[PDB]
Design a protein around this ligand. Structure first.
Ligand SMILES: [Zn+2]
Lengths: 328, 240, 222
DNA sequence: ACGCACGAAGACCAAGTCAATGCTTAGTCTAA
């Protein structure tokens, strides 16, 4: 079962790329030693081959959101929006092993390695939630195969396809946002400001003297609060395509996926919680080539069976199933 | 040797611990080293605990650990074998870069196990496949199992030397990381991309991850001189 | 019964295989997928992964392998080291612990190890055209590869999508099926190039360490 | 009353890198 979700991000999407990369004030990535350098946290870029500038094949980087991040976002959305309220309604309680399995598929609950009988595999892989995301001490094969969030760009034509050519962006989609942290003590201006500080003026004087001495020592050869740097993000408004496939899905699993897609807009993508990065709105959801996204979320006469099945599953779901899956 | 657990009774010669159960069912493989646990052997049910984060590398779901793995799971064994090379003669330390260069350029002929940890101390005793032939060395680095070919390492070193032969400022042709964590690990540098022939670039792009990891410790501006690693089995036995 | 060349084209980068990626293993996985869709998930996978349209080579000692060479890896771009992590949201777990959803008495999470361990791992991603040589039925192999969508590994996160495939009959002189894990006592005349002795499994599954045997592994393919 | 919490501890060598994409020039008449 193929799920095609068209995602447009209202706010920039920031997936931090590993590594210590530098940038200058003018915007030159990795400036030479001559000019000043400031730390930069670039976006997650994947090397892809594309026909750039009428070339036969060019390995150009493409800013994407990692597929594992999308998988974890879907899992967290399910847990925090349908699974956890359903278990709370029954006053269910989970041990550490079951909870770790449910939230990250971590086998710490029973790292011995437990055999699974064929009947047990049949029963558990049919679970509405744990079947999609395999793991735990048993560590099955999940039925969910979610792709990365490839932007609809010129370089992603051979990964996305030509079905959504109308929304492609020709130029670059990355922008550098500069951050700064200021020492609050240096911004005091009157004894009224320093009234709340227990040391009053003396504490601020000692703080400023220590800062000056540390700065002088560092210039001659403990880190203060003051810091200036930038992080690279993907510009807002770019459309993204998310491809989700479920292998041999039951009605309950598809219903759960649809519920998560309904509640997915409330969550964020990748990082940037402080700056409200990653906010997005679902534009279209496609089920096996059939559009299902109504303005009131995923609905229609062709998905009532999935919603009914998942509602029935939520009605009878208990923590004992999670414990059995986690071998706790 | 044949199995990772074989290092105990062959180079450490440690007798089995007391109070171990005896198998009396149809033989099943060890949960760590995949060694068969036949009738009449000594084992113990798995009690790894909640801090065991290597369930993905377990050989089988037998939940049984042979006495050799029970020895190899001791803290003194895990700490001592963090940067070890276990051959027939003894256990050698490959922590230094010169030792790694010697291992990946002049490997010992006998079967050996190569150890290396990516953190303070990790379970590596029971996850390393044996190296039957020195021309195909299997190295376990943290959670990564690497394949290193000494001929590929030698060819890459020759390529780097020929590319840096003329220029006075030595510069690596390929980006490498000791931790194998950088996003540019294994990618050609600017010097390699715009100063190497097509054959050299194709060879450098078509190397195994283990070869990149090894070159990250061998290939440098001043190539370390290979030297024989010291015998370490005495220290591990004394600390046990 | 016929000599074949299998070509696979990628629409997404795949995980570069650490060891040999064998055509017979992929065909067995696809056959197991077919019998799963036809019977369900209660089947024994070991009972259907040898029903492949490939004829077998048997050595003197009875050790047998499929005549299906390991996939050749030709890279259209430099390998990219892909980074992935794993973490349980500590604030979310703390909230659940407060509300009784989680039964944890421990005061603090331990990012170094345990239930709340943060882990960092890497695997390489490559753009490649997968070419391998085998002896079997063209129609059945093409039918099996028709249902294959992803190649290599890390398929849960969508690595190695198949843009297309092609199966062609080629002369025997091009390249043999021998570029695989052959048994220890295989005849020298049928081996293409140098073969180093190592430990690997001869029949799929190839990750089962209990099935591992001393085998001749091609040096120019590992 | 076995299970879980919680600090101390023990391996300990250690480099070179950090761009990946630029590209031109006027005929159609065949529905209101
Ligand atoms: Zn064992």
């Amino acid at each position: 079962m193929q799920i095609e979700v068209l995602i447009r991000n209202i706010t920039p999407i920031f997936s931090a790329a590993p590594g210590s990369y530098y940038v200058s004030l003018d915007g030159t990535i990795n400036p030479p030693q001559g000019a000043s350098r400031f730390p930069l946290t670039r976006a997650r870029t994947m090397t892809v081959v594309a026909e750039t500038g009428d070339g036969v094949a060019k390995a150009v980087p493409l800013p994407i959101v990692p597929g594992n991040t999308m998988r974890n976002l879907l899992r967290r959305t399910m847990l925090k929006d349908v699974i956890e309220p359903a278990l709370r309604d029954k006053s269910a309680q989970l041990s550490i092993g079951a909870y770790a399995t449910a939230y990250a598929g971590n086998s710490s609950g029973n790292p011995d390695g437990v055999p699974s009988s064929f009947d047990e595999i049949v029963t558990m892989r049919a679970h509405p939630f744990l079947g999609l995301f395999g793991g735990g001490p048993r560590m099955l094969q999940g039925r969910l195969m979610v792709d990365s969030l490839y932007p609809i760009h010129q370089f992603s034509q051979r990964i996305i396809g030509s079905d959504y050519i109308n929304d492609s962006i020709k130029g670059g989609i990355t922008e550098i946002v500069w951050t700064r942290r200021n020492d609050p003590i240096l911004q005091l201006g009157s004894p009224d400001d320093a009234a709340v500080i227990e040391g009053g003026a003396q504490a601020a004087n000692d703080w400023i003297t220590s800062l000056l001495a540390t700065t002088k020592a560092k210039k001659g050869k403990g880190r203060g609060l003051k810091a200036f740097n930038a992080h690279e993000v993907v510009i807002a408004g770019v459309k993204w395509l998310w491809r989700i496939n479920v292998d041999r899905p039951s009605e309950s699993q598809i219903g759960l996926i649809l519920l998560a897609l309904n509640k997915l807009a409330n969550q964020r993508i990748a990082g940037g919680h402080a700056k409200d990065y990653g906010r997005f709105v679902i534009e279209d959801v496609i089920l096996d080539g059939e559009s299902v996204w109504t303005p009131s979320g995923v609905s229609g006469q062709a998905t009532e069976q999935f919603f009914d099945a998942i509602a029935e599953a939520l009605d009878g779901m208990t923590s004992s199933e999670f414990e059995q899956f986690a071998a706790s | 040797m044949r199995y990772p657990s074989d290092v105990v009774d062959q180079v450490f010669k440690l007798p089995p611990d007391k109070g171990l159960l005896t198998w009396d069912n149809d033989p099943v493989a060890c949960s760590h080293c995949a060694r068969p646990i036949e009738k009449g052997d000594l084992y113990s049910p798995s009690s790894v605990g909640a801090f065991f984060s290597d369930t993905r590398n377990l050989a089988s779901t037998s939940r049984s650990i042979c006495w050799r793995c029970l020895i190899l799971r001791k803290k003194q064994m895990l700490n001592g074998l963090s940067y070890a090379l276990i051959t027939q003669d003894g256990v050698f330390q490959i922590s230094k870069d010169t030792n790694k260069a010697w291992l990946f350029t002049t490997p010992p002929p006998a079967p050996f196990f190569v150890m290396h940890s990516s953190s303070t101390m990790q379970h590596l005793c029971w996850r390393t496949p044996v190296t039957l032939d020195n021309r195909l060395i299997k190295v376990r680095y943290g959670n990564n199992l690497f394949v290193v070919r000494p001929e590929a390492i030698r060819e890459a070193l020759e390529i780097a030397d020929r590319m840096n032969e003329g220029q006075k400022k030595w510069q690596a042709p390929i980006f490498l990381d000791r931790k194998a964590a950088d996003s540019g690990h294994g990618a050609l540098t600017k010097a390699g991309r715009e100063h190497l022939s097509a054959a050299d670039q194709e060879f450098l792009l078509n190397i195994t991850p283990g070869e990149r990891w090894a070159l990250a410790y061998i290939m440098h501006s001043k190539r370390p001189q290979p030297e024989e690693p010291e015998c370490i089995t005495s220290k591990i036995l004394e600390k046990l | 019964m016929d000599f074949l060349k299998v070509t696979i084209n990628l629409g997404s980068p795949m995980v570069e295989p650490g060891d040999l990626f064998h055509l017979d293993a992929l065909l067995g996985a696809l056959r197991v997928s077919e019998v799963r869709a036809e019977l369900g998930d209660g089947i024994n996978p070991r009972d259907h992964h040898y029903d492949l349209p490939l004829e077998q080579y048997r050595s003197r000692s009875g050790q047998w392998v499929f005549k299906a060479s390991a996939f050749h890896i030709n890279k259209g771009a430099a390998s990219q080291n892909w980074m992935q992590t794993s973490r349980i949201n500590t604030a979310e777990a703390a909230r659940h612990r407060s509300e009784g959803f989680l039964l944890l008495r421990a005061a603090k999470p331990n990012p170094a190890g345990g239930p709340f361990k943060n882990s960092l791992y890497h695997y390489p991603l490559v753009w490649a055209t997968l070419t391998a040589y085998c002896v079997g039925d063209q129609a059945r192999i093409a039918d099996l590869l028709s249902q294959c969508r992803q190649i290599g590994g890390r398929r849960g996160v969508g690595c190695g999508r198949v843009a297309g495939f092609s199966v062609e009959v080629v002369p025997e002189v091009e390249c043999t099926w021998a570029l695989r894990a052959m048994p220890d006592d295989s005849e020298q005349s049928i081996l293409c190039g140098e073969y180093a002795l190592a430990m690997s499994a001869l029949q799929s599954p190839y990750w089962d360490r209990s099935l591992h045997k001393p085998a001749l592994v091609p040096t120019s393919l590992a």
